Design a binder for this molecule. Structure first.
Ligand SMILES: *[C@@H]1O[C@H](CO)[C@@H](O[C@@H]2O[C@H](CO)[C@@H](O[C@@H]3O[C@H](CO)[C@@H](O)[C@H](O)[C@@H]3O)[C@H](O)[C@H]2NC(C)=O)[C@H](O)[C@H]1NC(C)=O
Ligand SMILES: *[C@@H]1O[C@H](CO)[C@@H](O[C@@H]2O[C@H](CO)[C@@H](O[C@@H]3O[C@H](CO)[C@@H](O)[C@H](O)[C@@H]3O)[C@H](O)[C@H]2NC(C)=O)[C@H](O)[C@H]1NC(C)=O
Ligand SMILES: *[C@@H]1O[C@H](CO)[C@@H](O[C@@H]2O[C@H](CO)[C@@H](O[C@@H]3O[C@H](CO)[C@@H](O)[C@H](O)[C@@H]3O)[C@H](O)[C@H]2NC(C)=O)[C@H](O)[C@H]1NC(C)=O
Ligand SMILES: *[C@@H]1O[C@H](CO)[C@@H](O[C@@H]2O[C@H](CO)[C@@H](O[C@@H]3O[C@H](CO)[C@@H](O)[C@H](O)[C@@H]3O)[C@H](O)[C@H]2NC(C)=O)[C@H](O)[C@H]1NC(C)=O
Ligand SMILES: *[C@@H]1O[C@H](CO)[C@@H](O)[C@H](O)[C@H]1NC(C)=O
Ligand SMILES: *[C@@H]1O[C@H](CO)[C@@H](O)[C@H](O)[C@H]1NC(C)=O
Ligand SMILES: [Fe+3]
Ligand SMILES: [Fe+3]
Lengths: 348, 348
């Protein structure tokens, strides 16, 4: 079996996948599922081979025995002659975002506000913010800390999914895939920009990438950077330019995960695949571009220069980092998770 | 060893072979095996010398180091003046064939349909259709694409062998030799003519050759040309008369293969052998006709005028054509093969 079966989450990621298969000549093929946890189960079960996960989902995959393969790398500030595949990975900035018009909304005034999230169990939209909120309150009532939220993945009949809009017919409310209007980085931002929520937990890069006409989709083009403000742990409301000291935490990059037995092969294929269809690649933009999806961060983030290597075969722990592992572990004492609990025997 | 040891597949091909031996005065003799792969292994091992293979089987033979010797060549409409052994080869038309009666079955609704095939790994019955289906779906789960199939050679306990009937006691279900009821071109057709399947992947010529009493065997004689029809890649359902732009792909002719050292010998013996017992032959029909097989396409196709030479020194690649070689290679990224793996190994 020399093909690598990519798991796509939802029809958008699935149609991109379909193309990737065709252009790579079935070097890559596609399994599909509604949610990322379903895909993690597909990879567990041998019906798929690999997928690109947010660090939060990498915690779950690693609890189920999967390992990381290749990290994402995005344009750096240091500017290095070292090649993208060899350049050290940077992290990204998890930040809270508000409309500047809503004054008097600081860190310490978030209770009973409407919040927007990428999805449940992701790093910027959930793990870091909710972990911090639980730490301060001394309470596991993250479910009742906000009046309403949109957090795809949560209990669909809960208040954490009250704000999620579904697709366009309004169906599949709060499924954690891009079919949902407010899924993901982009979706949490949109959720804020149409003021369905008061704060959005995203990354630094989302704010710039969707403001000042960088996205010429409906909601986004008209958006404006100065109308938005980064809440800090201190209690301030700084502008987006001040992200380097107004960030909630530093988040490990979305990385590819696979089973151990299939790791080295998947890496191989992917290293070559990005040569063919990556940023500066032979068939990019002729036949297919792997890291470009028309602003929907499909399969990978759109701002991915390339997939960088890692040192050795790292575990999910080494990759994510002892301290982020602990922050996650602690947030998860507040909440049992089916996939996590079914797998919990693998690490005892 | 001036004898050419022909490999026969099944007792049916074996008993025709036997006669061919006797009349040719042991200029040719017979080895036997259950399947075509087994015969290719006999040629590898020096235990046989040559046999006539479908283009798909020629790819496998070529991965194991065998070379083509003489193509089959069929009654043409054009050129027709250069003698048969010197006439350029034309290819053949791989087509999908359905009962006309079954409306609402085009190309794009073949999922969950019942399929009939010549055998696994052949050009018209397997490689071209499945290759396209895998390309369309972006998925290597071709085994689960059709509800049931008959594809001799597949895992006999699988669903791709569910429909195959065996011989007459029903034994040897789904072995890819003519003793199984739905093996080969003819066998795929019949699988349709008795509606055990909904589509059959065969060549143009099979359709005419079994309809309108062109065959006076049981199932075939009563057939009508217009009760069967050809699905197109566009999605149409045009007549068999319309084969020329409702063809799935162009198929390289069934060719004889041998080991590389024995090629030039086998050629001469065969060119002389067809002079003796061929279409236009001194001992045909008197004592033996090499290209007539009791309507069972034994050893060679029945519509074979003769064996034509090949241009230059061809590899299995050159003969089949750079593009169909790739169509095969990709479909085989979805499936490991024992003989191919042993040959990817031992010859290197
Ligand atoms: C699909 O995946 C295959 C498998 O990796 C890719 O084919 C491989 O790519 C190149 C193109 O010929 C070959 O690599 C080179 O081989 C030669 C030795 O002859 C040498 O320059 C280097 O050692 C280098 O590795 C390799 O032979 C080839 N593999 C096969 C089996 O042909 C292919 O590029 C991928 N295509 C797409 C569209 O994804
Ligand atoms: C927060 O996210 C934004 C958006 O990704 C980051 O800004 C981006 O930073 C890179 C590197 O600093 C910029 O590239 C630089 O731009 C100049 C063009 O003047 C170019 O010559 C250099 O080669 C260099 O790559 C990039 O333009 C910029 N993106 C946008 C949309 O402005 C920012 O660095 C992040 N902030 C923190 C604190 O990490
Ligand atoms: C089996 O194969 C051998 C070939 O190796 C056949 O032997 C050949 O038999 C013919 C006579 O039938 C000989 O032909 C000669 O041709 C010239 C014309 O250029 C003529 O002048 C001679 O008088 C003679 O007719 C030929 O020499 C001979 N070849 C060998 C190598 O001995 C044999 O007939 C084949 N038998 C069957 C049943 O296939
Ligand atoms: C699809 O397959 C059918 C059957 O294999 C092809 O029809 C056959 O075509 C040959 C050559 O065109 C015909 O031979 C002709 O016979 C007549 C005598 O009646 C003669 O006038 C011509 O000189 C030529 O020799 C043959 O009769 C015909 N067979 C049948 C049963 O109709 C057809 O050409 C194939 N079409 C495509 C597009 O591949
Ligand atoms: C089949 O794959 C080819 C490349 O091998 C691609 O160009 C084509 O688009 C694929 N088929 C379809 C229906 O897209
Ligand atoms: C809160 O602070 C940090 C989380 O940022 C954590 O290390 C610490 O254990 C927590 N303690 C309490 C009492 O919440
Ligand atoms: Fe993330
Ligand atoms: Fe064939």
């Amino acid at each position: 079996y020399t093909r690598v079966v990519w798991c796509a989450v939802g029809p958008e990621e699935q149609k991109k996948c379909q193309q990737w298969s065709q252009q790579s000549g079935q070097n890559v093929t596609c399994a599909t599922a509604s949610t990322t946890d379903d895909c993690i189960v597909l990879v567990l079960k041998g019906e798929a081979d690999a997928l690109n996960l947010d660090g939060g989902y990498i915690y779950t995959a690693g609890k189920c025995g999967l390992v990381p393969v290749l990290a994402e790398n995005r344009k750096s500030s240091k500017h290095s002659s070292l090649d993208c595949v060899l350049r050290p990975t940077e992290g990204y900035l998890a930040v809270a975002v508000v409309k500047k018009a809503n004054e008097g909304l600081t860190w310490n005034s978030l209770k009973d506000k409407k919040s927007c999230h990428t999805a449940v169990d992701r790093t910027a939209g959930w793990n870091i913010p909710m972990g911090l909120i639980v730490n301060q309150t001394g309470s596991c009532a993250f479910d009742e800390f906000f009046s309403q939220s949109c957090a795809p993945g949560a209990d669909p009949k809960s208040r954490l999914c009250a704000l999620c809009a579904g697709d366009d017919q309004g169906l599949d409310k709060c499924v954690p895939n891009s079919k949902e209007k407010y899924y993901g980085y982009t979706g949490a931002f949109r959720c804020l920009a149409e003021d369905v929520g008061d704060v959005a937990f995203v990354k630094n890069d989302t704010v710039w990438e969707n403001t000042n006409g960088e996205s010429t989709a409906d909601w986004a083009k008209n958006l404006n950077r100065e109308d938005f403000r980064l809440l800090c742990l201190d209690g301030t409301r700084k502008p987006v330019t001040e992200a380097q000291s107004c960030h909630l935490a530093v988040a490990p990059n979305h990385a590819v995960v696979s089973r151990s037995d299939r790791a080295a092969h998947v890496k191989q294929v992917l290293l070559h695949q990005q040569a063919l269809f990556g940023k500066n690649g032979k068939n990019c933009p002729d036949k297919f571009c792997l890291f470009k999806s028309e602003t929907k961060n499909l399969l990978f983030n759109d701002n991915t220069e390339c997939l960088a290597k890692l040192g050795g075969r790292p575990t999910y722990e080494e990759y994510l980092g002892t301290e982020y592992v602990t922050a996650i572990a602690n947030l998860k004492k507040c909440s049992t998770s089916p996939l996590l609990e079914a797998c919990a025997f693998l690490t005892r």
